[PDB]
């Protein structure tokens, strides 16, 4: 256990409690400092230690700490809460500073959890002009994060670009991932799409053909 | 009040040296160390390592400790730091970070050692080894099953281009559009070390029908004119 590790991400809906967890050895009898970066932004020093937080921070954010792991409890989440965190701590032995691996925290919309509707992006005209054919698949409407798309079960991953998703006005995602080849190619043998959302439990299987 | 400010953004090259100043105010700045942390795009946090403005002593980390050097002027209250022998991985912003000297005890209320109280707002620094390339314009018409299910999205895909600053128009009957559309954007670092851009304009079925065609524009760097992609019913 080198460095302070923390959950990728952790999603939570309005009104509920957001625990975010810091790895470590001999972390509890550390003090251990939480700081918030929003989008485009510099981070701000939200936790020194325990309930000690700097002018201006709201009493929702507390922090804890016993033997090996810490604990950022964010109470009663609101919207603005929705950033990356990153604990940290400085051994004044060696006198290091480090931070943890960051957890990306999202409020949910609190919309059902539903699967994605996969449509196919046909090349027609763009395969054409260009010498090379851009086709793909358009996974849309669907939550939570995230989903995992392959082409041909993984028997290409030469042209491939999946695109990160945007957060619909309906609050749901929309993702889209594309491949190019040449027309020689395009012709003859098949394309599909393997789209893989694990938070519904459900797979979808599309071909993208001329 | 209490405040740092960074130097503009900077754009490098591979093997070149970038400086970057930070300007501090409020306060007193012989008081407490002054640190410099980075972090690469959709990365995390890095200390990179401090000075103290009293003294002018300096501790980096193990990993930069050859390239880079951070120095001070106590007249203008401004720190420095500088990174020498740059690569592409070098990619990252730049902040500098205010840590209370333990040693010194303000009258601010606030006696937070070992943490980085106060941030710059950060200076953005690039080092590319890339040609600056024009995109790859591709369009796509809403899917029929898609047109079934009541909505309707066309897609434009600029593929393979440098920078990342690009500008994406979506024209519905040679009509400029306004609210409707959202993008997003992908870095391949590994061979291109380019950017891929996919923007989705979103209709409902009846403007589709009613409006009756559809074009993405496009203006970018790397190109002489402004590039439009058409496509309609038919």
């Known amino acids: 256990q080198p460095g302070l590790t923390q959950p990728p991400s952790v999603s939570v809906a309005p009104g509920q409690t957001a625990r975010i967890t810091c790895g470590g050895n001999?972390?509890?009898?550390?003090?251990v400092h939480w700081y918030q970066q929003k989008p485009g932004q510099a981070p701000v020093l939200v936790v020194y230690?325990?309930?000690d937080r700097p002018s201006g921070i709201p009493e929702r954010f507390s922090g804890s700490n016993s033997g090996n792991t810490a604990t950022l409890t964010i109470s009663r989440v609101e919207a603005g809460d929705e950033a990356d965190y990153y604990c940290?701590?400085?051994?004044?032995?060696?006198?290091?500073?480090?931070f943890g691996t960051g957890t990306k925290v999202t409020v949910l919309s609190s919309a059902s959890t539903k699967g994605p509707s996969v449509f196919p992006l046909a090349p027609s005209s763009k395969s054409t002009s260009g010498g090379t054919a851009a086709l793909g698949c358009l996974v849309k409407d669907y939550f939570p994060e995230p989903v995992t798309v392959s082409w041909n079960s993984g028997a290409l991953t030469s042209g491939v670009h999946t695109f990160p998703a945007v957060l619909q006005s309906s609050g749901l995602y929309s993702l889209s991932s594309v491949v190019t080849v040449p027309s020689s190619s395009l012709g003859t043998q098949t394309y599909i799409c393997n789209v893989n959302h694990k938070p519904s439990n459900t797979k979808v299987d599309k071909k993208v053909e001329p | 009040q209490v405040q740092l400010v960074q130097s503009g953004a900077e754009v490098k090259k591979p093997g070149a040296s970038v400086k970057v100043s930070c300007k501090a105010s409020?306060?007193?700045?012989?008081?407490?160390?002054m640190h410099w942390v980075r972090q690469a795009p959709g990365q995390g946090l890095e200390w990179m390592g401090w000075i103290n403005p009293n003294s002018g002593g300096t501790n980096y980390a193990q990993k930069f400790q050859g390239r880079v050097t951070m120095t001070r002027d106590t007249s203008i209250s401004t720190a420095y730091m500088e990174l020498s022998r740059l690569r592409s991985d070098d990619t990252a912003v730049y902040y500098c970070?205010?840590?209370?000297?333990?040693?010194?005890?303000?009258?601010?209320?606030?006696?937070?050692?070992?943490?980085?109280?106060?941030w710059g707002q950060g200076t953005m620094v690039t080092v590319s080894s890339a040609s600056v390339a024009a995109p790859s314009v591709f369009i796509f018409p809403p899917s029929d099953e898609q047109l079934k299910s009541g909505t309707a999205s066309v897609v434009c895909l600029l593929n393979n281009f440098y920078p990342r600053e690009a500008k994406v128009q979506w024209k519905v009957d040679n009509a400029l559009q306004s609210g409707n559309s959202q993008e997003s954007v992908t870095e391949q670092d590994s061979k291109d070390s380019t950017y891929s851009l996919s923007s989705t304009l979103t209709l409902s079925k009846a403007d589709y029908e009613k409006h009756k065609v559809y074009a993405c524009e496009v203006t970018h760097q790397g190109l002489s004119s402004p590039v439009t992609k058409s496509f309609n019913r038919g």
């Open positions: 970070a205010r840590s209370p000297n333990p040693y010194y005890y303000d009258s601010s209320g606030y006696y937070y050692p070992g943490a980085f109280d106060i």
């Open positions: 230690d325990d309930s």
């Open positions: 940290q701590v400085w051994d004044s032995s060696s006198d290091h500073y480090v």
């Open positions: 001999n972390i509890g009898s550390k003090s």
């Open positions: 409020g306060y007193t700045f012989t008081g407490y160390y």
